[PDB]
Amino acid sequence: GYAGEITAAVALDTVVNDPSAVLIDVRAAREKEASGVPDVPGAASSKVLEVEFAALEDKKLRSQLKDPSFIEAQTTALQIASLRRIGTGSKVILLDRYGPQAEAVARELAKKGYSRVYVVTGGFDGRAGWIQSKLQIKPFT
């Protein structure tokens, strides 16, 4: 279908109380090192997944491709759609740094039949995002 939006506080509530929901951090290892990661109640920790944004690091290859940032978003969505644990009925919440990268991934994931995809508004660091919403965070490990 189409990607949706969810505030960070509701994303927290959903990953705790919706057994069909997962929270997928799509930030780069680097972004998590700098800012930390979500600290969620214990039972819910296993529902927070990590699919790092599928960056094309090879600058030589990158300079040859049409719209490489779209290839990266498509590749991240393909990896998420291939997670054994979830299917198209799962509620899939995506968390990036500021919002727009998660939006690109969510859009491609919805084209694969995932009808319950949501992006955390503001991401982790952005306006009204995770940190700004006064949710708890912990160092990246």
Side-chain angles (χ1 to χ4, degrees), residues 87-133:
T88 59
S90 303
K91 182 155 180 159
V92 174
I93 301 159
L94 302 188
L95 174 71
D96 73 335
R97 188 160 192 189
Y98 303 111
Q101 284 208 316
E103 291 169 350
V105 175
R107 203 165 284 132
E108 294 310 301
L109 191 60
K111 291 172 193 168
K112 316 206 136 93
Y114 287 78
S115 50
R116 305 209 298 141
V117 187
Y118 299 84
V119 170
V120 172
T121 301
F124 196 73
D125 294 324
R127 207 185 29 171
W130 195 278
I131 289 183
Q132 295 282 93
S133 288

Side-chain angles (χ1 to χ4, degrees), residues 1-56 58 61-133:
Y2 289 86
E5 292 175 335
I6 190 174
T7 67
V10 169
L12 171 59
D13 186 63
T14 304
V15 84
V16 167
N17 296 301
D18 186 337
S20 72
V22 294
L23 175 62
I24 311 192
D25 197 342
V26 300
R27 292 180 294 149
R30 178 178 62 81
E31 292 177 327
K32 297 184 284 187
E33 259 295 332
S35 303
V37 294
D39 188 6
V40 306
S45 55
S46 46
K47 296 162 83 182
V48 183
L49 312 177
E50 286 192 330
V51 184
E52 306 181 4
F53 194 73
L56 288 155
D58 193 296
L61 174 70
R62 187 193 191 82
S63 55
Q64 296 171 81
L65 307 167
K66 304 198 263 193
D67 198 351
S69 69
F70 177 74
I71 298 315
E72 295 168 324
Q74 271 178 297
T75 302
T76 314
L78 180 65
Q79 288 164 12
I80 290 157
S82 305
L83 289 159
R84 207 192 281 300
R85 182 209 176 112
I86 58 155
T88 59
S90 303
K91 182 155 180 159
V92 174
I93 301 159
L94 302 188
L95 174 71
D96 73 335
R97 188 160 192 189
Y98 303 111
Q101 284 208 316
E103 291 169 350
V105 175
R107 203 165 284 132
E108 294 310 301
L109 191 60
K111 291 172 193 168
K112 316 206 136 93
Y114 287 78
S115 50
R116 305 209 298 141
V117 187
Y118 299 84
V119 170
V120 172
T121 301
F124 196 73
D125 294 324
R127 207 185 29 171
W130 195 278
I131 289 183
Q132 295 282 93
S133 288

